[PDB]
RNA sequence: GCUCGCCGGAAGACCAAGGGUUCCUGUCCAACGUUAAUCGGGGCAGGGUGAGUCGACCCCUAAGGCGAGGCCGAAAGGCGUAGUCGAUGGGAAACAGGUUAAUAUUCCUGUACUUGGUGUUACUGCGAAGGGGGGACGGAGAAGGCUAUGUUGGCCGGGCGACGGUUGUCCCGGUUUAAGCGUGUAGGCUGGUUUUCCAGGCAAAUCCGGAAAAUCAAGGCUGAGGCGUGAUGACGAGGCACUACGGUGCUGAAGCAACAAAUGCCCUGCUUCCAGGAAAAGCCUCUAAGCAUCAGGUAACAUCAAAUCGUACCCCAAACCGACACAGGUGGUCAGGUAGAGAAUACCAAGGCGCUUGAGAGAACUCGGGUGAAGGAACUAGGCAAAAUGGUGCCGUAACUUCGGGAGAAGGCACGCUGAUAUGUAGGUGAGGUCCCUCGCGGAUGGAGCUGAAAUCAGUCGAAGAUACCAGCUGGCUGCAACUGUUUAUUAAAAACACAGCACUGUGCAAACACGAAAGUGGACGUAUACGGUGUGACGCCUGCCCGGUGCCGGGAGGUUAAU
RNA sequence: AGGACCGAACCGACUAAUGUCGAAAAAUUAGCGGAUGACUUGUGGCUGGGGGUGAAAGGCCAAUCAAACCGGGAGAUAGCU
């Protein structure tokens, strides 16, 4: 049984990383929402 | 929980 | 030559090959090659815009000289070569000045034949010159649509254009489709038919043969659900519709040509 | 020429352990906890300047801090750089 | 610790990915561990990851991304040029031995190599966002040469045995050694060299391409492996001493040959086929502007530098993905012996394990197996399941057929061991020797040694010799689908889908068509022997009549008819 | 030579049994199919919700699919319980 989560750090950062978020107007609104909510981890960047 | 399995199908009273 | 394979297996029983012993059994001319990546039928947006495209053999692009604008300089045919990008074969051709080019191979072209382009070339097959120095009634190919544009008509295997009439700055051509079209008399055309007229005699035998030409399977609209095609639906082989495209437009005879800016050049449409 | 104010930051401590003892014992290698930046050239210059010994070569590694659970909180110790400084021939001073 | 059992194309070893300290040591046993736990991947503390050469970084590019300007778009933004990123690909260089509780191609010993910088010397044309070459490329197949590796013999060390025998064609163990450097081989490719000229390589070119002439006929490129050296070194069975009895130190014989042999290497080769098989840089070469004293280049020698980051540990798994210490999933590399065609299979090696509740008992019943009188499908929806068949060689094999098949049709015979043919044959390999040379990794002869099927004849044992494991049931009629393939991840694998073939139809290229407010993109760097849509669905024989309805195509006289 | 044959790896999933608060939210065991191709697989990339992709089952699109998920309109509305 292959499951849905097949981790890959490169794909993770290219898909949801900080620079991926900053690339688009909508990704920068994700960061604004998570900053407003007070999220300790802003992105998947560690 | 977070996952509730679908109940088994009833006997087809058809 | 048209060779029928022997039925040593299904998928081999119905294969008919077009095996030309005169084609170069080596690597193509590397300076005239470049990368030609597949698209899968996907466009700029990444969406399938043409269907049934995908896979197939990797193939390099041969830079074929369609313009044929090296005028006066004679050229000798040194090779006939297989081209994965055409139904026609190409000819590697060496010019007297030491330049090599690929051209479409006319019907009876061989290694060692002399070809040249320009207003003063002979009426040999494979010679290119404006359709103002070509006689009327002569059979040509690789015909330009605009002077200097390069040559867009009659480029498939066995195809050719007939120079039917000639009235001033224009020449009427019978195209391979049966259409009469006006084209500027300053447009170049190569003399003769395109070679490899046996190309349409191949049979491919099996599904994998089409698959490795980059052709992916075609699902019939009837075989689908009503949500997928205008055909589709039914409790077992129902049609009851008029045949249409996947986007609802009548196929089975409905003219889709709408130009209005090139109608002046079409003397008579195909029949 | 690395400046002495930088050399005086490069070195942090000597690393005391069984492997460090054995290295100084039978290979003439002193083991140091150095700064994090701490290039090999900076470490060599700093050792030769401050300990006034003759350095042959510097091998460096980064030690990643351990995740420790102090009380009921998850903490992590700092990564630090370790330098194996091989002295040339004479001795430590 | 001694036995026993299990895996051993893994349940061993090494990695990538992923994880992130789980690694090692000491200590503790609350919780965790499906039980106890003194133990642990658990708690606590300490230690542990050492690189010019490995990898990343770096240089280069693919798909693709972003994208100055630009084009387009209510805005947001889309596309895209120059460019710039982007590996899963291309690009410099290190091996063997030793060592830690834990790292090692990183430490140490020994022996190397690479690329740059700076100098000195000597000789000189150097010079690029530019040109050319190269890099640089498919599938399949076959063979030869090899090696890894194994077997045997020889050699060396040890043994002579708990129950008969065992000083012998007896038993046990070892018999290892790299990169680098030199040689240039089996082999592959290629005719070289000089001169002259040229409308080509955006300009130039001495380079490439082309042409002619002469001349010599060889040169050049590539290349496994072997050999020499590396290496009077290392390692080395064992022996010798001391205890932390875990190990530490010292010494150290032989260290050869033959045969067999890869799926590895030569080989990015060769042959062949069609479906016609990356790019760019490094690299080599050519010049332009430019500088020609300089700069720069080339070659020696010297010196300097090679940073930074990763390196522990798991990695078919208790450490990753599955909520679990979960019978699941997870890419690559290595892969010994006997039998075997084999990476099957059985038993083993190295190595690793006994799967984290046990102890009894020996009811029904359930599960997984074994055997079964007589019968033999009577069972049942249905031979479901089970049983059965099963290998090799040879003999033999029907209808039908699209001439390929059917077919391994069906059936049948032989098969172990021993001896002889023949103190091991046919075959393979191949030393010495003896010649020959345009002398070396050479050629010819030569056959020592090694290895070695298969067969026949004779004998012989058993109920049985393809003895285990392994390993087709076969035949007859018929529907459907031509066929290989695909599908409802997780109740449907099919007659459904696809398919080659066929037909209709559209499309003349700024194609139709599709995605897109558009720009644009796909179609296609294609051009009617092409492309799209639709239906049918190999092949064979064929495909009849109806245009009234609906559609589509054509006409446009007349009637009706919008904005205006 | 071959979408050739037999058969491991590998990819599948035809039959049966077990399991069905499972060892497992799809397995195991014994058989079974393909196994040089329309094959399989790693890494990276692209296509997105009336959208994609689909050898077509309304299949798949993160254990969710005749219109994914998350947040919002939103305390939708509910003559119904
Ligand atoms: Mg992604
Ligand atoms: Mg199509
Ligand atoms: Mg079709
Ligand atoms: Mg179809
Ligand atoms: Mg159907
Ligand atoms: Mg259907
Ligand atoms: Mg509809
Ligand atoms: Mg229908
Ligand atoms: Mg239907
Ligand atoms: Mg019906
Ligand atoms: Mg009807
Ligand atoms: Mg060092
Ligand atoms: Mg380091
Ligand atoms: Mg811990
Ligand atoms: Mg441990
Ligand atoms: Mg412990
Ligand atoms: Mg207790
Ligand atoms: Mg307990
Ligand atoms: Mg612990
Ligand atoms: Mg690109
Ligand atoms: Mg862009
Ligand atoms: Mg802009
Ligand atoms: Mg780059
Ligand atoms: Mg890479
Ligand atoms: Mg990178
Ligand atoms: Mg270790
Ligand atoms: Mg220029
Ligand atoms: Mg050998
Ligand atoms: Mg060897
Ligand atoms: Mg021996
Ligand atoms: Mg003795
Ligand atoms: Mg005795
Ligand atoms: Mg040779
Ligand atoms: Mg193989
Ligand atoms: Mg100089
Ligand atoms: Mg020199
Ligand atoms: Mg390690
Ligand atoms: Mg370990
Ligand atoms: Mg357990
Ligand atoms: Mg497990
Ligand atoms: Mg085997
Ligand atoms: Mg096995
Ligand atoms: Mg019992
Ligand atoms: Mg039985
Ligand atoms: Mg019975
Ligand atoms: Mg009996
Ligand atoms: Mg009986
Ligand atoms: Mg009977
Ligand atoms: Mg009955
Ligand atoms: Mg009955
Ligand atoms: Mg029944
Ligand atoms: Mg059965
Ligand atoms: Mg059975
Ligand atoms: Mg041999
Ligand atoms: Mg028998
Ligand atoms: Mg079977
Ligand atoms: Mg019937
Ligand atoms: Mg039929
Ligand atoms: Mg079928
Ligand atoms: Mg198949
Ligand atoms: Mg599929
Ligand atoms: Mg299903
Ligand atoms: Mg179902
Ligand atoms: Mg099924
Ligand atoms: Mg189907
Ligand atoms: Mg049909
Ligand atoms: Mg039919
Ligand atoms: Mg009809
Ligand atoms: Mg009519
Ligand atoms: Mg009309
Ligand atoms: Mg096959
Ligand atoms: Mg399998
Ligand atoms: Mg499937
Ligand atoms: Mg099944
Ligand atoms: Mg088959
Ligand atoms: Mg098979
Ligand atoms: Mg992928
Ligand atoms: Mg349906
Ligand atoms: Mg799902
Ligand atoms: Mg809806
Ligand atoms: Mg919602
Ligand atoms: Mg509201
Ligand atoms: Mg409500
Ligand atoms: Na009609």
Q: Extract the tokens encoding C169.
A: 């700055």
**How is chain A split into domains, by residue range?**
1-46
Resolution (A): 2.6
The DSSP output letter for A38 is T
CA–CA distance, C127 with C75 (Å, rounded to integer): 10
Beta-carbon contacts of B4 under 8 Å, excluding residues fewer than 6 positions away, are none
**Is-contact C66 C95, C-beta < 8 A?**
no
Give me ligand 14 centre to Cα C156, in Å: 72
**Is-contact C168 C131, C-beta < 8 A?**
no
- Sorted by where each starts, the structural domains of chain D and their CATH numbers stand as 2-93 (3.30.70.330)
Q: Quick check: helix, strand or coil at residue D61?
A: strand
Lookup result for tokens 């009851």 = C240
CA–CA distance, C59 with C214 (Å, rounded to integer): 11
Q: Are strands C170-174 and C161-167 parallel, antiparallel or unpaired?
A: antiparallel
CA–CA distance, C131 with C158 (Å, rounded to integer): 20
Burial B1-14 (b: 16+ CB within 10 A, else e): eeeeeeeeeeeeee
Give me ligand 11 centre to Cα C164, in Å: 50
As assigned by CATH, the class of the A1-46 domain is: mainly alpha
* DSSP β-bridge partners for residue C181: C173, C266
- The gap between C51 CA and E71 C1' (Å) is 29
Residues 113-172 of C with CB under 7 A from strand E: 145, 149, 152-159
**Is-contact A42 A35, C-beta < 8 A?**
yes
**How is chain C split into domains, by residue range?**
1-113, 117-194, 195-271
- For residue D92, CA distances in Å to C22, C208, D27 come to 83, 76, 12
CA–CA distance, C167 with C169 (Å, rounded to integer): 6
CA–CA distance, C144 with C129 (Å, rounded to integer): 10
**Is-contact C153 C188, C-beta < 8 A?**
no
CA C85, C87, C88: angle at the middle one, nearest 5? 95
- For residue C148, CA distances in Å to C92, C256, D20, D65, D72 come to 22, 29, 81, 72, 82
- For residue C103, CA distances in Å to C69, C188, C249 come to 12, 14, 39
Task: State residue D84 phi and psi, 5-degree precision.
Answer: -95, 105
- Of D63, D55, D91, D92, nearest to D79 by C-alpha is D63
Burial, C143: exposed, middle or buried (Cβ in 10 Å; 0-12, 13-18, 19+)? buried
In order, the DSSP letters of C160-176 are -EEEEEEETTEEEEE-T
Q: Extract the tokens encoding C179.
A: 């259409």
CA–CA distance, D93 with D87 (Å, rounded to integer): 10
**Is-contact C250 C241, C-beta < 8 A?**
no
Q: Quick check: helix, strand or coil at residue D42?
A: helix
In order, the DSSP letters of D2-41 are --HHHHHHHEEEE--SHHHHHHHHHS-EEEEEE-SS--HH
**Is-contact C150 C135, C-beta < 8 A?**
no
Residues 70-99 of C with CB under 7 A from strand E: 72-74, 81-82, 84-88, 94-99
Give me ligand 67 centre to Cα C227, in Å: 26
Residues 32-61 of C with CB under 7 A from strand E: 33-37, 39, 41-53, 56-61
Give me ligand 34 centre to Cα C212, in Å: 24
Residue by residue, what is the 3-state secondary structure of C42-88?
A: ECCCCCECCCCECCCCCCCEECECCCCCCECCCEEEEEEECCCCCCC
As assigned by CATH, the class of the C1-113 domain is: mainly beta
- Of C66, C268, C255, nearest to C182 by C-alpha is C268
Lookup result for tokens 């899968």 = C40
**Is-contact D65 D79, C-beta < 8 A?**
yes
The answer to whether the beta carbon of residue C260 comes closer than 7 angstroms to any atom of strand E is: no
Tally Cβ neighbours within 10 Å of residue C152. Answer: 13
* DSSP β-bridge partners for residue C62: C33
As assigned by CATH, the class of the C195-271 domain is: few secondary structures
In order, the DSSP letters of chain C are -EEEPP-SSTTTTT-EEE--TTB--S---GGGEE-----TTB-TTSSB-SSSB------PEE-B--S---BS--EEEEEEE--TT-SS-EEEEEETTS-EEEEE-BTT--TT-EE-BSTT--S-TT-EEETTTSPTT-EEESB-SSTTT---BS-STT--EEEEEEETTEEEEE-TTS-EEEEETTSEEEES-BS-GGGGG----SHHHHHTTTB-----GGGS-TTT-SS--TTTT---S--B-TTS-B-SS------SSSGGGEEE---
What was the experiment behind these coordinates? Answer: cryo-EM
**Is-contact C91 C77, C-beta < 8 A?**
yes
| C46, closest nucleotide (Cα–C1') | F47
- The gap between D62 CA and E52 C1' (Å) is 19
* DSSP β-bridge partners for residue D27: none
**Is-contact C28 C48, C-beta < 8 A?**
no
| Structural element, H or E, at residue A23 | helix A18-23
């Amino acid at each position: 049984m292959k499951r849905t989560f097949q981790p890959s750090v490169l794909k993770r950062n290219r898909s949801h990383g900080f620079r991926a978020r900053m690339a688009t107007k909508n990704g920068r609104q994700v960061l604004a929402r998570r900053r407003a909510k007070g999220r300790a981890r802003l992105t998947v960047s560690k | 929980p977070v996952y509730i399995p679908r109940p088994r199908p009833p006997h087809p009273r058809l | 030559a048209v060779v029928k394979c022997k039925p040593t297996s299904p998928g081999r029983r119905h294969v008919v090959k077009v095996v030309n012993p005169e084609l170069h059994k080596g690597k193509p001319f590397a300076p005239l090659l470049e990368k030609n990546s597949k698209s899968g039928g996907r466009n700029n947006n990444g969406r399938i815009t043409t269907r049934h495209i995908g896979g197939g053999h990797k193939q390099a692009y041969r830079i074929v000289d369609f313009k044929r604008n090296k005028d006066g300089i004679p050229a000798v045919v040194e090779r006939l070569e297989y081209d994965p990008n055409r139904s026609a074969n190409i000819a590697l051709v060496l010019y007297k000045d030491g330049e090599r080019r690929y051209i479409l191979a006319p019907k009876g072209l061989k290694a060692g034949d002399q070809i040249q382009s320009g207003v003063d070339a002979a009426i040999k097959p494979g010679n290119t010159l404006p359709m103002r120095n070509i006689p009327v009634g002569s059979t040509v190919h690789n015909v330009e649509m605009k002077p200097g544009k390069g040559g867009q008509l009659a480029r498939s295997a066995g195809t050719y254009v007939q120079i039917v009439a000639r009235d001033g700055a224009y020449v009427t051509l019978r195209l391979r489709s049966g259409e009469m079209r006006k084209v500027e008399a300053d447009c170049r055309a190569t003399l003769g038919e395109v070679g490899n007229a046996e190309h349409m005699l191949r049979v491919l035998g099996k599904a994998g043969a089409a698959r490795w030409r980059g052709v992916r399977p075609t699902v019939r609209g009837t075989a689908m659900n009503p949500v997928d095609h205008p055909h589709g639906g039914g409790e077992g082989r129902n049609f009851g519709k008029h045949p249409v495209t996947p986007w609802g437009v009548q196929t089975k005879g409905k003219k889709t040509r709408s130009n209005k800016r090139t109608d002046k050049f079409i003397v008579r449409r195909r029949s | 020429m690395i400046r002495e104010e930088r050399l005086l930051k490069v070195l942090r401590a000597p690393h005391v352990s069984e492997k460090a003892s054995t290295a100084m014992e039978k290979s003439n290698t002193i083991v140091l906890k150095v700064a994090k930046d701490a290039t090999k050239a900076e470490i060599k210059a700093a050792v030769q300047k401050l300990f006034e010994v003759e350095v042959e070569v510097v091998n460096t590694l980064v030690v990643k801090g351990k995740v420790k659970r102090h009380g009921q909180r998850i903490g992590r110790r700092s990564d630090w750089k370790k330098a194996y400084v091989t002295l040339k021939e004479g001795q430590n001073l």
